[PDB]
């Protein structure tokens, strides 16, 4: 079980890169990849990711094609460079959960028993946070109807670390806002 | 044994039949499945062993610094003074058996 996930900026930026570049291979609505990370205690920290070739069909949810061998090879190379990260889960984009997703989950749950799914919404929206995190569990469902497998939400937050925030703060220097604000920042918040 | 051979396998042919069934099924299933499975498991783990050993070979470069462990603690951790006259804690000993080390 998990009580919260902490996501670093680097993964967010790499996901934007993936979504922009994919046009080089063939038009698709969404993209998919692995998340690497680590466990402290019931809190999960994500810190890297990489692409994986994926294909889909727009109507039939019985048809799709991930790829085992690319995944295993790339994880081998990444492990040869560094050893403290391990497989933790996966991500896809697109704004709404697709029926298909559980069928993917029960695949790569084999590579990590506690596979957690993070949805990152690459194109903007005004109201709030960009990402969502979900975990898969069966249920009693009712007084009496068939048990099944679905996701439940888990609370999500965006983290930072030393020498990742410095680059961010440098990139964001041109546009800045008051640290505390004097009735010009608190009043906006209420709106 | 002689009791089963005589009173059953000879006289009660159905017991020979059940012997045949059990022997055939168990023999073929276990031999094929376990021999194939274990042989490929062994090959894979041998190769991964080889890669890890290659990784450890490089880091053992020649230049070393003579040092003496002053104290040892379990929480596996050691306090070293080194002949440059420096003192360092460390939380993990590394490429030697922590049970083999002693003050």
């Amino acid at each position: 079980a998990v009580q919260k996930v902490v996501v670093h900026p680097l993964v967010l930026l790499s996901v934007v890169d993936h979504f922009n570049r994919i046009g080089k291979v063939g038009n698709q609505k969404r993209v998919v990849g692995v998340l690497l990370g680590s466990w402290q205690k019931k809190v999960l920290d994500v810190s890297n990711s990489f692409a994986v070739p994926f294909d889909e069909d727009d109507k039939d949810d019985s048809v799709w094609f991930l790829d085992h061998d690319y995944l295993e090879n790339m994880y081998g190379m990444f492990k040869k460079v560094n050893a403290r990260e391990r497989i933790v889960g996966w991500y896809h984009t697109g704004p709404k959960l697709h029926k298909n997703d559980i069928a993917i989950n029960e695949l790569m749950k084999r590579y990590c028993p506690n596979s957690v799914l993070v949805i990152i919404d690459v194109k903007p929206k005004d109201l709030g946070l960009p990402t969502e995190a979900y975990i898969s569990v069966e249920e009693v469902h009712d007084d009496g109807t068939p048990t099944s497998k679905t996701f439940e939400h888990v609370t999500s937050e965006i983290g930072a670390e030393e020498a990742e925030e410095v680059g961010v703060e440098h990139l964001l220097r041109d546009i800045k806002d008051t640290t505390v604000g004097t009735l010009s920042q608190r009043i906006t918040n209420q709106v | 044994e002689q009791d089963g051979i005589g009173e059953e396998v000879l006289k009660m042919s159905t017991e020979e039949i059940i012997q045949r069934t059990r022997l055939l099924d168990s023999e073929i299933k276990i031999m094929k499945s376990e021999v194939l499975r274990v042989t490929h498991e062994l090959q894979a783990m041998k190769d991964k062993i080889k890669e890890n050993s290659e990784k450890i070979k490089v880091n053992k470069t020649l230049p070393y610094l003579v040092s003496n462990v002053i104290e040892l603690l379990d929480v596996k951790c050691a306090v070293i003074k080194t002949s440059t006259r420096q003192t360092y804690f460390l939380p993990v000993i590394g490429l030697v058996d922590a049970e083999k080390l002693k003050p």
Partner: protein, 191 residues
């Protein structure tokens, strides 16, 4: 000599439990797969093969690779409990062909049809025309139930290639002693 990538597409439906052939249908299919994959490898050292299973939905149990031994090692432990489904198997085979590394390679799908099949011709013809426009070769082996589906397959292969098309073979066999002996001559003929 031609550079092409080949997918073998094999059945583990429940009918394979039976035993008209000498040991069982499975073992026969194993020997057939062995012979064909060795043929397609030996004919050209850079080509590659992959393996797909149709029963109870399509499992892409090996991504396209030039290594042959993995295919054999993986092919075992197919315990026949599935029911057939033809169309989704073909669709996912096309989908996986869409992502060759060496996009100079030609496109081939080889399928073993060892079971009765239920389908509507109005779907099959449309799949056929899709592969027409996409220029995909198809090769089929019957063995078992000629009466049930011989006409459907005749129509499929006929529409898919013709009008001086290649004449992609459609093999059929009596319940003779061996698969290999018939399979040898007509579909495969290296050089």
């Amino acid at each position: 000599m031609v550079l092409e990538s080949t997918m073998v597409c094999v059945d583990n439906s429940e009918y394979m439990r039976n035993g008209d052939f000498l040991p069982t249908r499975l073992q026969a299919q194993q020997d057939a797969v062995n012979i064909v994959c060795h043929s397609k490898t030996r004919s050209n050292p850079e080509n590659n093969v992959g393996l797909i299973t149709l029963a109870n939905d399509c499992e892409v149990l090996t991504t396209l690779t030039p290594d042959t031994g993995r295919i054999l090692s993986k092919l075992h432990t197919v315990q026949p409990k599935g029911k057939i489904t033809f169309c989704t198997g073909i669709r996912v085979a096309h989908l996986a062909l869409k992502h060759r590394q060496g996009k100079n390679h030609k496109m081939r799908i080889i399928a073993f049809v060892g079971s009765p099949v239920e389908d509507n011709e109005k779907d099959l013809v449309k799949l056929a025309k899709r592969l027409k426009k996409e220029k995909v070769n198809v090769d089929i082996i019957n063995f078992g139930e000629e009466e049930v589906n011989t006409e459907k397959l005749t129509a499929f292969v006929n529409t898919l290639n013709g009008k001086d098309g290649t004449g992609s073979h459609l093999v059929t066999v009596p319940p003779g002693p061996s698969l290999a002996d018939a399979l040898i001559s007509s579909p495969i003929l290296a050089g």
